[PDB]
Design a protein around this ligand. Structure first.
Ligand SMILES: [Mg+2]
Ligand SMILES: [Mg+2]
Ligand SMILES: [Zn+2]
Ligand SMILES: [Zn+2]
Ligand SMILES: [Zn+2]
Lengths: 286, 130, 69, 49
RNA sequence: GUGCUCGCUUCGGCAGCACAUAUACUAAAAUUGGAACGAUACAGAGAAGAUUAGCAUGGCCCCUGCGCAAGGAUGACACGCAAAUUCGUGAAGCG
RNA sequence: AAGGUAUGUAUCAAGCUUACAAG
């Protein structure tokens, strides 16, 4: 039902060689979601690595901007529901065999024949990004994805192959933590990992820290930039732009709005292209 | 065709509304994929050079407009000073001597190229996992 | 088992109406009665779907348009 | 740059995939406008005829 | 690894030449979803009396068959929507 | 060879199917 010319393939699946040789079939396996006969491709990423063929069709990759074999985001290198919750919209797709399943895949293929360049509905909200997902977009990826999976007969100690057992050995997997949207087991741990970062301790008082030592102004931040980034928060009581240290001092009347500034700027408020400098002010008449 | 037409830059603030990946050029949803006509042999040679020794020359057309470096892990290239795999090398080091029986006379003693080499607590955890 | 009998009622009427439209795809009484049956559930994003694919079969009737509108 | 070859197909294999699927026919081309002459209604008597 | 060349000085050491990257990698699987048939118990059998030959139409139902034959209980599955006639309500317009 | 010993449901394994994507 489907031909192709070249696969989607995020960068960690290609392997560390710029010179890889790759083979193709014409109607290979089926897609592991929609049973559609794509063209399976196979290659060797690296010299200690399994072959990692091709898992879903080009259509089921163009739907969710997903790579071709490891099923991660093509823009980030992240799972699917991390992206869809991080963009707060799911781009629904049915679950059963026909019930709207191959119907909607067929029709979304029929209205994807023109472009072949971008995902079908994610294009509008893949622009308003880079705030909540960019903190976890692991560049320089780990190639343990590509290592060959663990053999039996070392698990049973029987492996007569000796050294030339191509798969692996002495990696016993653990039966406590190992589809396409939800629910996936390590993703819950990763969203707990992002919800539970390492901040500064919240000091024992009643919201007196409306001042904060934010600095690293340099030549990027100006006065109206930071006070219009705080005017959407609310009202000041005293601003200054102290340029001996390249810093700015803002407060709020009844702290709460500047409270989310403390949530926005734990080395995190990224405007004008800079990791801003943040440590804690006085609020102590000092 | 003229150089000035295609080399003329684009006026604008570059449109930073997009992400890095969607602003980047493509034809295929993942990078601009285009045909090529490299020599088979030098492709295979520099491929095997990287596959063995972890360095190769870089393939490009318009990255910096000048590109003549090595890639992968850099320092081992100049440790061997840019030799290849099809070269009788400067030294014959860390070789590994096989024992040979190439008579085809003794039986169960002839190992030609099939010669196996001169070199020839976890199970509690494995039984508790299973 | 009130949820069981409720979803049983809903699933049996939906299966009935889907087989009724799948038999005759031309008489549009089935789509308007099925779509206003889901409109009787009073919170829907699927009766829109029933009308919006009920005009794929026949857009030239006024009754479907004015009833969906 | 990559090298793309095409895998051999052995001529002793049956068809591999179950070509037996039927989904209903999809959404057609969305309708062109209709643009007749002004539609008349006859009477209550010739309609009775 | 090999074989060849004193080729450079020891048969031995070295140098050059020729040869140039296989594998749906597993004997496994912690494996995997398990539909068909057979068993179990139900339901049971077209056409306004009874027994009934059939051939069709529709598609998200298939089986046997080399089938653009044919047979699978007519292969099964196919049901109450009345409309316009009386009357209520409401709208648009006019006198 | 079909044309006759009906078919239609509800639970219970091998046959066949991939040996894959995976913090
Ligand atoms: Mg029949
Ligand atoms: Mg028949
Ligand atoms: Zn697919
Ligand atoms: Zn991938
Ligand atoms: Zn092993």
């Amino acid at each position: 039902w489907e031909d192709a010319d070249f696969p989607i393939l995020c960068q960690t699946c290609l392997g560390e060689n710029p010179y890889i040789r790759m083979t193709k079939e014409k109607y290979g396996k089926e897609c592991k979601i929609c049973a559609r006969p794509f063209t399976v491709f196979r290659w060797c990423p690296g010299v200690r690595m399994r072959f990692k063929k091709t898992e879903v069709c080009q259509t089921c990759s163009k739907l969710k901007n997903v790579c071709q074999t490891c099923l991660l985001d093509l823009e980030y290198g992240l799972p699917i529901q991390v992206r869809d919750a991080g963009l707060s919209f799911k781009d629904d797709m049915p679950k059963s065999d026909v019930n709207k399943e191959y119907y909607t895949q067929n029709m979304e293929r029929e209205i994807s024949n023109s472009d072949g360049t971008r995902p079908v509905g994610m294009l509008g909200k893949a622009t308003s990004t880079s705030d909540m997902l960019l903190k976890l977009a692991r560049t320089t990826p780990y190639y343990k994805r590509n290592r060959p999976h663990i053999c039996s007969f070392w698990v049973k100690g029987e492996c007569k192959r000796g050294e030339e057992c191509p798969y692996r050995h002495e990696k016993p997997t653990d039966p406590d933590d190992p589809r396409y949207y939800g629910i996936n087991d390590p993703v819950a741990d990763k969203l707990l990992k992002r919800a539970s970062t390492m901040p500064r301790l919240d000091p024992p008082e009643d919201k007196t820290i409306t001042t904060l030592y934010v600095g690293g102004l340099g030549d990027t931040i100006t006065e109206t930039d930071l006070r219009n980034h705080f005017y959407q928060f609310g009202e000041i009581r005293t601003i200054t732009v102290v340029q001996r240290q390249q810093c700015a001092f803002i407060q709020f009347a009844t702290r709460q709005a500047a409270e989310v500034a403390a949530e926005k700027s734990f080395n995190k408020l990224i405007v004008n292209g800079r990791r801003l400098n943040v440590k804690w002010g006085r609020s102590q008449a000092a | 065709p003229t150089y000035e037409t295609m080399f003329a830059p684009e006026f604008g603030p570059e449109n930073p509304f997009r992400t890095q990946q969607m602003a980047a050029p493509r034809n295929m949803l993942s990078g601009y994929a285009e045909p090529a006509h490299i020599n088979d042999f030098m492709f295979e040679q520099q491929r095997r050079t990287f596959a063995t020794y972890g360095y190769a020359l870089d393939p490009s057309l318009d990255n910096h407009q000048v590109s003549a470096k090595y890639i992968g892990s850099v320092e081992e290239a100049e440790k061997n000073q840019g030799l290849t795999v099809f070269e009788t090398g400067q030294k014959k080091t860390e070789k590994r001597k096989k024992f040979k029986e190439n008579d085809a006379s003794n039986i169960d003693g002839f190992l030609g190229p099939w010669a196996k080499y001169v070199d020839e607590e976890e199970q509690k955890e494995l039984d508790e996992i299973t | 088992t009130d949820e069981e009998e409720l979803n049983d009622y809903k699933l049996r009427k939906r299966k009935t109406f889907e087989d009724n439209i799948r038999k005759n795809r031309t008489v549009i009484s089935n789509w308007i009665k099925y779509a206003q049956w889901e409109e009787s559930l009073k919170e829907i994003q699927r009766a829109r779907s029933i009308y919006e694919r009920a005009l794929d079969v026949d857009y030239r009737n006024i009754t479907l348009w004015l009833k969906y509108a | 740059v990559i090298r793309m070859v095409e895998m051999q197909k052995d001529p002793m294999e049956p068809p591999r995939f179950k070509i037996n699927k039927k989904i209903p026919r999809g959404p057609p081309s969305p309708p062109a406008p209709v643009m007749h002459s002004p539609s008349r209604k006859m009477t209550v008597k010739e309609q009775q005829e």
